[PDB]
Design a protein around this ligand. Structure first.
Ligand SMILES: *[C@@H]1O[C@H](CO)[C@@H](O[C@@H]2O[C@H](CO)[C@@H](O[C@@H]3O[C@H](CO)[C@@H](O)[C@H](O)[C@H]3NC(C)=O)[C@H](O)[C@H]2NC(C)=O)[C@H](O)[C@H]1NC(C)=O
Ligand SMILES: *[C@@H]1O[C@H](CO)[C@@H](O[C@@H]2O[C@H](CO)[C@@H](O[C@@H]3O[C@H](CO)[C@@H](O)[C@H](O)[C@H]3NC(C)=O)[C@H](O)[C@H]2NC(C)=O)[C@H](O)[C@H]1NC(C)=O
Ligand SMILES: *[C@@H]1O[C@H](CO)[C@@H](O[C@@H]2O[C@H](CO)[C@@H](O[C@@H]3O[C@H](CO)[C@@H](O)[C@H](O)[C@H]3NC(C)=O)[C@H](O)[C@H]2NC(C)=O)[C@H](O)[C@H]1NC(C)=O
Ligand SMILES: *[C@@H]1O[C@H](CO)[C@@H](O[C@@H]2O[C@H](CO)[C@@H](O)[C@H](O)[C@H]2NC(C)=O)[C@H](O)[C@H]1NC(C)=O
Ligand SMILES: *[C@@H]1O[C@H](CO)[C@@H](O[C@@H]2O[C@H](CO)[C@@H](O)[C@H](O)[C@H]2NC(C)=O)[C@H](O)[C@H]1NC(C)=O
Ligand SMILES: *[C@@H]1O[C@H](CO)[C@@H](O[C@@H]2O[C@H](CO)[C@@H](O)[C@H](O)[C@H]2NC(C)=O)[C@H](O)[C@H]1NC(C)=O
Ligand SMILES: *[C@@H]1O[C@H](CO)[C@@H](O[C@@H]2O[C@H](CO)[C@@H](O)[C@H](O)[C@H]2NC(C)=O)[C@H](O)[C@H]1NC(C)=O
Ligand SMILES: *[C@@H]1O[C@H](CO)[C@@H](O[C@@H]2O[C@H](CO)[C@@H](O)[C@H](O)[C@H]2NC(C)=O)[C@H](O)[C@H]1NC(C)=O
Ligand SMILES: *[C@@H]1O[C@H](CO)[C@@H](O[C@@H]2O[C@H](CO)[C@@H](O)[C@H](O)[C@H]2NC(C)=O)[C@H](O)[C@H]1NC(C)=O
Ligand SMILES: *[C@@H]1O[C@H](CO)[C@@H](O)[C@H](O)[C@H]1NC(C)=O
Ligand SMILES: *[C@@H]1O[C@H](CO)[C@@H](O)[C@H](O)[C@H]1NC(C)=O
Ligand SMILES: [Zn+2]
Lengths: 902, 11
């Protein structure tokens, strides 16, 4: 019989009711350089079943409580047993209070403690963040509880289902602002023991999870809006960022987004206020703390003067994502981390819906397809993938919990939920969603609860008919990994499904309860006209006339790629599709014009179509003005460039892409009035960005001319940059590529004086575009100088140099020679040896290069590889795959490009 | 924690 304090899950014998927590960060170090926080807490809990032990979470806390580590009292007139002893059990992160008698069912108890911890710069629990304002190093205190770190700030029953109300008090320097989940109760009062400090009490939280608590002490200022319903909206940031107006876009979109969600969810925003705060270098990206959402600065702030349209899109979607959680996740909370995919998957889908509401002309909802669907299919088409669902009993330790937060959980989660909403219809999905939120408000759920409420909505109507229960259908998409390729023979209308793997030689060893068969919702378009919807049942092969064609007709499946699968056709149908796109592309929805490209390249990788069929699918692009299909092609061809840009294949490839993109360049040349004014909507701006990128990188003289002229103009007047932020990355790069040390030194100067990270990033990247060996070598010589290149930017810069075909050997020589820097940078910040190894060896595709990677590895004796260990093994494995791919594809691909470049 | 995801992704 194992002791309960040696088990990772808490007993269910005691449940929390409410907590008082007072925290006091000390933002001045103790002279040895240690920063601490002090705290005091009282938790009131109810005894459900008799027990003589209290087990509560505690991590890295020292107790200063009088007597034992806690004091234990009865609520009202309840008696309390005496404490035998208190002990900390570090492995399972518990404070354990052994009692001399048993607590009694139905009785409430209050347990008080006093404690302190390090206010470490570790982004965990209550922690410190250091940044610069002019001459001064500033330090603030802030929180990150996600997932199991509330217990690092105060002792608590730190599991998400164990909800309670929280009364937070902050004790802080009197000239700093204190924020938490709720509004402050009133004005701060001076601390009696030292009036240099103030005390800020916050209103009681709703019933809520520990992982969603937040409290922050800083010098931050805000911009504000009061919504019509009295809800106060604030964006918080560094005083200088606020003063420059960088919080305005976030402020602009927040009101509309909250309004969208209240309506979408049929549920009022559950808090009196909304704070969002931009933190410098918040590595977690963003965190949905209820009423006080934290973001890295570059995710929330926006500078219209220097930021591109893609920055704007990042802000509105990141906001919509975190605000989505203020209902789904925070109001109704998944009972355990094994169901994290539902929470993050749901937010990862509806972020597009929320953002679309704020920017209705942007067609943002489309972006889930390239952004999430095809992104996650890359890793879900591997034998090494995993199902969305995990048994709760397999997820116990904080490490196992962290593993829940991956591409599958977020992106496949979003994909399958989007598929679900689509086959139910949004109206029906929303009914079940509202029912679910209403039923479980301030409580906890599993994914089965959502399915049940969606089933109730289906059962209450007669229009939408499903081939099975919602649960049975969704089980196919959640209980087994991967997805099917749907293959259609249009001569017969025969339709088949099989588990899709990119590696046709791969062995799947993870068994499925369903033998890798799905229940698949299949929409289709025939000759541009929508057909009746179809469901492929759990069978390998079926037949339907919907998918049978005449000689001159065509069919296309999975309209707008709402379904989580890829489609293959017989060659005849592929040609009819190709013919349609060649003569009138408008007949096929833009998303599907992209899908044809995405799927065919994947199918070619899997040896299900010849690579030439996939390349044939790019032929229509000379008449394509829209973003997504061009994006599909560029994404699919980046590997081709990577394998071939040092070979005889490259000339014909460059020429072919010049032929394809020249008309688009011409189109935008006129549309933009000689480049003086951007296209109006987001998609058209993205298309222009990619068009100029593709034209210049493939050597279109007109683009090269544009880049030289603008950069010359900039050099003639450094303070007035004539290059629109959307075009900076391309214009900078191509101009530095054309020029020498004059263009290089100018951009270097601009980089050194750059006040803004995103602009500094563009400049750093563009400096790697030089075609002068001596410049790229000198530049490599800077990457390790922290006065010239930030340590956190070093590997990125080397990678950018490696990406330059000329820089490739230079960077590889640099990494080998200076690998004697692992013992200077496994302790001096991470560095990321893993990402650096992958970037520099990315191109390797020959036996000779494999020999060099092996010979470099022959320094196994000492120094090792660190966090890049086995990333080095990944590189050796990938090189082998590349060798095999180039050998199989070189001849066929060379001839295709030659043939189709006029 | 925050993920929208960057809008490329394709193997
Ligand atoms: C969690 O924190 C709460 C906020 O501090 C505590 O509630 C407060 O308790 C105070 C006294 O313990 C009350 O303040 C005043 O104290 C004088 C002492 O001289 C009393 O006589 C008065 O009753 C009281 N003043 C008034 C106007 O009633 C606060 O009233 C009270 N605040 C509330 C209820 O919002 C909780 O006690 C604390 N929880 C635990 C378990 O200790
Ligand atoms: C929680 O309690 C821990 C154990 O008491 C503390 O960790 C200890 O910190 C001590 C003081 O900083 C260290 O001991 C010695 O301290 C003196 C004076 O600062 C130094 O001259 C010595 O070099 C130092 N000794 C050593 C070996 O470094 C200990 O390092 C350390 N002890 C242990 C067992 O880890 C935590 O500091 C404390 N945390 C908080 C937030 O209060
Ligand atoms: C947050 O929302 C605000 C209100 O919608 C936006 O304010 C708008 O800013 C626009 C860009 O600066 C202005 O457009 C034009 O600016 C030029 C440059 O000076 C002028 O020639 C034009 O006269 C002017 N607009 C018009 C319609 O003539 C808008 O004036 C202004 N709109 C309003 C209603 O005040 C903010 O831009 C927005 N912030 C962000 C970052 O998006
Ligand atoms: C946190 O503050 C709230 C609000 O003041 C406290 O709620 C009160 O609790 C007492 C004792 O159980 C009740 O008699 C009152 O009815 C409650 N008031 C309200 C408005 O709900 C709560 O007890 C506090 N938490 C702790 C741990 O003391
Ligand atoms: C809050 O008060 C503190 C202390 O008076 C200020 O911190 C000092 O700021 C000056 C620069 O103005 C520095 O030279 C000192 O080193 C700081 N002292 C300490 C102990 O850190 C702080 O600037 C004030 N902040 C605001 C927003 O008013
Ligand atoms: C949630 O949805 C319900 C049901 O649709 C809303 O109630 C309806 O509101 C409209 C507003 O004009 C009325 O015409 C209907 O008669 C109402 N239906 C019912 C059954 O009451 C409700 O307003 C929504 N609530 C929130 C908080 O968004
Ligand atoms: C986790 O969630 C469930 C609901 O899904 C909670 O159980 C409900 O509790 C409420 C309020 O006491 C009751 O009215 C319901 O009848 C319960 N529903 C059930 C048992 O299905 C449960 O309390 C939550 N767990 C914790 C630890 O709070
Ligand atoms: C389409 O599917 C049908 C089966 O439903 C295939 O036709 C069958 O072929 C086998 C060959 O052994 C015969 O024994 C069956 O009697 C046939 N069934 C018929 C004619 O109804 C057909 O080959 C498939 N065509 C494809 C995949 O292109
Ligand atoms: C496929 O996606 C497109 C968007 O890419 C959808 O087109 C939108 O349709 C709605 C309703 O008909 C309109 O309000 C929008 O203005 C359309 N946008 C564009 C850019 O055309 C289309 O509805 C989707 N097709 C299907 C069958 O769902
Ligand atoms: C899969 O198993 C077969 C044995 O039938 C083997 O030939 C092959 O190398 C294995 N792995 C891969 C990646 O193909
Ligand atoms: C092509 O098809 C679109 C969509 O049906 C139609 O609006 C357009 O008139 C057609 N264009 C030509 C040149 O036939
Ligand atoms: Zn999220």
């Amino acid at each position: 019989q194992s002791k309960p304090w040696n088990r990772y899950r808490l007993p269910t014998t005691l449940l929390p009711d409410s907590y008082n927590v007072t925290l006091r960060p000390y933002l001045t170090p103790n002279a040895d350089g240690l920063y601490i926080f002090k705290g005091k807490s009282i938790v009131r809990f109810l005894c459900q079943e008799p027990t003589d032990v209290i087990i509560i979470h505690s991590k890295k806390l020292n107790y200063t409580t009088q007597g034992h580590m806690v004091v234990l009292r009865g609520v009202g007139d309840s008696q309390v047993p005496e404490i035998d002893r208190t002990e900390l059990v570090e492995l399972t992160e518990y404070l354990v209070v052994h009692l001399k008698g048993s607590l009694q069912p139905g009785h409430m108890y209050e347990m008080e403690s006093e404690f302190q911890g390090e206010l470490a710069d570790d982004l965990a629990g209550f922690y410190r963040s250091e940044y610069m304002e002019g001459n001064v190093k500033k330090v603030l205190a802030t929180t990150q509880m996600q997932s199991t770190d509330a217990r690092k700030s105060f002792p608590c029953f730190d599991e998400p289902a164990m909800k309670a109300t929280f009364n937070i008090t902050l004790i802080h320097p009197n000239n700093l602002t204190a924020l938490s989940n709720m509004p402050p109760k009133g004005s701060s009062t001076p601390l009696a023991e030292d009036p240099n400090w103030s005390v800020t009490e916050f209103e009681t939280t709703p019933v809520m999870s520990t992982y969603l608590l937040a409290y922050i002490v800083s010098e931050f200022q805000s911009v504000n809006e009061t919504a019509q319903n009295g809800v106060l909206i604030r964006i918080w940031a560094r005083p200088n960022a606020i003063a420059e107006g960088h919080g305005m876009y976030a402020l602009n979109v927040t009101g509309p987004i909250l309004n969208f969600f209240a309506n979408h969810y049929n549920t009022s925003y559950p808090l009196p206020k909304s704070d969002q705060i931009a933190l410098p270098d918040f590595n977690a990206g963003a965190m949905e703390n209820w009423g006080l959402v934290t973001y890295r600065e570059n995710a929330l702030l926006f500078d219209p003067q220097s930021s591109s349209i893609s920055n704007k899109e990042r802000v509105v979607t990141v906001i919509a994502h975190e605000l989505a959680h203020q209902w789904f996740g925070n109001l109704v909370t998944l009972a355990w981390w094994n169901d994290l995919w539902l929470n993050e998957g749901f937010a990862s889908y509806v972020e597009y819906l929320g953002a679309d509401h704020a920017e209705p002309t942007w067609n943002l909802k489309d972006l889930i397809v390239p952004g999430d669907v095809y992104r996650v299919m890359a890793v879900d088409a591997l034998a090494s993938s995993h199902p969305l669902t995990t048994p709760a009993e397999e997820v116990n330790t904080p490490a196992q919990i962290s593993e829940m937060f991956d591409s599958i959980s977020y992106s496949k989660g979003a994909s399958v939920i989007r598929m679900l909403s689509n086959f139910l219809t949004e109206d029906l999905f929303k009914e079940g969603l509202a029912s679910y939120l209403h039923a479980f408000a301030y409580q906890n759920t599993t994914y089965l609860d959502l399915w049940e409420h969606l089933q109730k909505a289906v059962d209450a109507q007669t229009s939408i008919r499903l081939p099975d229960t919602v649960r049975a259908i969704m089980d196919r998409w959640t209980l087994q990994m991967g997805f099917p390729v749907i293959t259609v023979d249009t001569k017969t209308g025969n339709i088949s499904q099989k588990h899709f793997l990119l590696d046709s030689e791969s062995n799947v060893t993870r068994s499925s309860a369903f033998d890798y068969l799905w229940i698949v919702p299949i929409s289709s378009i025939k000759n541009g006209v929508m057909q009746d919807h179809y469901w492929l049942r759990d069978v390998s092969q079926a037949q339907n006339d919907l998918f049978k064609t005449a000689s001159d007709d065509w069919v296309l499946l999975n309209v707008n790629v709402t379904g989580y699968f890829q489609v293959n056709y017989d060659e005849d149908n592929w040609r009819m599709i190709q013919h349609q796109l060649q003569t009138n592309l408008s007949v096929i929805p833009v998303i599907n014009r992209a899908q044809v490209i995405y799927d065919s390249f994947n199918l070619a990788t899997a040896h299900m179509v010849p690579v030439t069929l996939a390349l044939d699918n790019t032929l229509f692009l000379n008449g394509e003005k829209e973003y997504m299909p061009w994006q599909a092609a560029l994404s699919s061809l980046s590997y081709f460039s990577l394998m071939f840009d040092r070979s005889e294949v490259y000339g014909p490839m460059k020429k072919y892409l010049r032929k394809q993109v020249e008309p688009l360049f011409q189109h935008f040349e006129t549309l933009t009035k000689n480049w003086t004014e951007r296209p109006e909507n987001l998609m058209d701006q993205y298309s222009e960005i990619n068009a100029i990128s593709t034209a210049c990188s493939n050597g279109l003289p007109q683009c090269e001319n544009l880049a030289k002229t603008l950069f010359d103009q900039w050099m003639s007047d450094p303070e007035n940059n004539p290059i629109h932020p959307n075009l900076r990355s391309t214009i900078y790069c191509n101009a530095i590529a054309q020029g020498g040390q004059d263009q290089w030194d100018f951009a270097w100067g601009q980089l050194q004086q750059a006040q803004l990270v995103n602009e500094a990033d563009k400049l750093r990247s563009a400096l790697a575009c030089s075609n002068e060996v001596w410049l790229l070598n000198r530049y490599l010589g800077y990457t390790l100088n922290p006065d010239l290149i930030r340590k956190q930017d070093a590997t990125s810069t080397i990678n950018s140099i490696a990406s330059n075909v000329i820089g490739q050997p230079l960077a590889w020589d640099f990494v080998q020679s200076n690998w004697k820097k692992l013992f200077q940078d496994y302790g001096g910040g991470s560095f990321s040896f893993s990402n650096l190894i992958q970037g520099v060896t990315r191109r390797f595709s020959s036996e000779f290069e494999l020999q060099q990677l092996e010979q470099f590895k022959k320094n196994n004796m000492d120094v090792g590889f660190g966090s890049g260990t086995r990333a080095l093994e990944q590189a050796l494995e990938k090189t082998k795959a590349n060798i095999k791919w180039v050998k199989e594809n070189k001849e066929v691909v060379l001839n295709w490009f030659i043939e189709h470049s006029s | 924690r925050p993920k929208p995801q960057q809008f490329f992704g394709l193997m």
